[PDB]
Amino acid sequence: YFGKLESKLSVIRNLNDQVLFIDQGNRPLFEDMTDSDSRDNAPRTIFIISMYKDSQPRGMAVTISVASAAASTLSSENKIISFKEMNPPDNIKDTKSDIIFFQRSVPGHDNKMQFESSSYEGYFLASEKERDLFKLILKKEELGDRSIMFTVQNE
């Protein structure tokens, strides 16, 4: 059982300081901080990380949703990363969820975070280059894999 506690406006950036954003095609991608949304509103880069209490405490259970969107929540459904059409729910009657990730500090690096899928243990959010794009993907864990490390910046 997950119960929603509190939400925080957050920006996420890979170790190349490229910022996570949602593009015109509803895709989670990364862009150089230089070229990231500079608006005070920051509609395309500001995420809400919603923290959940857990009946089976295993770490910090969170959902990640777009702050400016009506209903766009990150999902690992089917071992792939998409924006699912929904809001973070008041509760989830399940110990696993395609929209719940465990936000964990990187081993040896307290200032960096990784996000482990609650649905797929050992699978993490990662930044991956594909042609000219940098995509948010779900990839299996090799210690010190830097592609799964992020800086999470409050508001």
């Binding site: 923290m51 209490k53 009946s55 259970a61 936000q103 307290d110």
Partner: protein, 100 residues
């Protein structure tokens, strides 16, 4: 640099408040909450259980007991600190406190 501590009243009264406070060096990402017995958050209890939780928006969560039964007095009540590291827990059984 990480801890969870419960403050409890030295005597039972009509309304009992247990105060759980967390201390974590991850200041932007830390919270505390209660688990009743093995695995029930307060939200999961049957209605009118006599347990209520107040989450303060250092993280704090108060657990408020009313219409206290012997099962409640002997229940293991756990406060959990959640942050980017592994959850940290502290627990109390009130009947042990009160009968000392």
């Amino acid at each position: 640099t990480r801890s969870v501590n419960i403050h409890v009243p030295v005597k039972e009264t009509s309304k009992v408040v247990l105060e759980c406070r967390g201390d974590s060096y991850f200041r932007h990402f830390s919270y505390v909450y209660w688990i009743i017995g093995k695995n029930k958050t307060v939200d999961q209890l049957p209605p009118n259980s006599g347990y209520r939780e107040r989450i303060y928006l250092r993280p704090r969560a108060d657990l408020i007991l009313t219409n206290i039964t012997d099962e409640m007095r002997n229940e293991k009540l756990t406060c959990v600190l959640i942050d980017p590291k592994d959850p940290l827990k502290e627990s109390v059984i009130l009947s042990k406190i009160w009968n000392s």
